[PDB]
Design a binder for these strands. Structure first.
Ligand SMILES: Nc1ncnc2c1ncn2[C@@H]1O[C@H](COP(=O)(O)OP(=O)(O)OC[C@H]2O[C@@H]3OP(=O)(O)O[C@@H]3[C@@H]2O)[C@@H](O)[C@H]1O
Length: 179
DNA sequence: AAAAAA
């Protein structure tokens, strides 16, 4: 549990935020070579192996990582531009976003913005949305989003994880409730 | 900061 989480957090740093600090160059789809990631991870944790990383990918409860052959990427969460190929979510009526209550006045004025990432992240699941908001602060509000309001304004929603969804932005008129 | 830990 403890060693996997540390290696998994470093993987997220490398694959979403700072591949260049380790000498890696993602392609336009966000993939790096698997052996490159293992060698990068080894300069911090020298006991990491290809099989140990493959384990983390297959057991990740959110679907954070994707392996295609000898290539690996994070599926969402990037702060550098990636051309993702996820399928569109056309079925969800409501989506959810958890956030510290202190952010609500700004969000009611501007809607949800991607901030430092490329996309706004939301969830199909209320618990997962609230647990994500709790990363940033103790007092959290659950935002309910009308997904069809989003599609009507042209902001298509993509299936990035099991429950994770990404969208360009969420205008304030599409936030129906804050709980 | 699933954005390492010091
Ligand atoms: N207009 C506005 N004004 C002020 N504030 C705003 C805002 N519009 C939005 N905000 C808030 O700014 C924060 C950005 O934080 P940021 O970490 O970029 O986003 P999120 O909290 O959505 O997390 C994403 C992934 O991170 C985890 O890692 P994971 O476990 O792999 O997956 C999960 C998950 O999918 C956030 O509080 C948001 O409300």
């Amino acid at each position: 549990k403890p060693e996997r989480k540390r290696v998994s957090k470093l993987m997220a740093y490398i694959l979403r935020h700072s591949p260049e600090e380790f000498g890696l160059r993602p392609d336009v789809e966000g993939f790096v070579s698997l052996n490159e990631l293992v060698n990068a991870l080894k300069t911090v944790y020298p006991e990491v192996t290809e099989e140990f990383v493959r384990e983390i990918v297959e057991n990740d409860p959110k679907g954070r990582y994707e392996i295609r052959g000898d290539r690996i990427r994070a599926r969402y969460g990037h702060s550098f531009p990636v051309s993702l190929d996820h399928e569109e979510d056309t079925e969800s009526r409501f989506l959810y976003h958890g956030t510290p209550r202190r952010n609500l006045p700004s969000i009611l004025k501007e809607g949800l913005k991607p901030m430092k990432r490329q996309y706004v992240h939301v969830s199909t699941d209320k618990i997962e949305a609230l647990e994500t908001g709790r990363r940033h602060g103790r007092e959290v509000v659950l935002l309910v989003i009308d997904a069809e309001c989003l599609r009507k304004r042209g902001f298509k929603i993509y299936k990035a994880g099991k429950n994770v969804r990404i969208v360009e932005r969420v205008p304030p008129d599409c936030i129906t409730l804050a709980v």
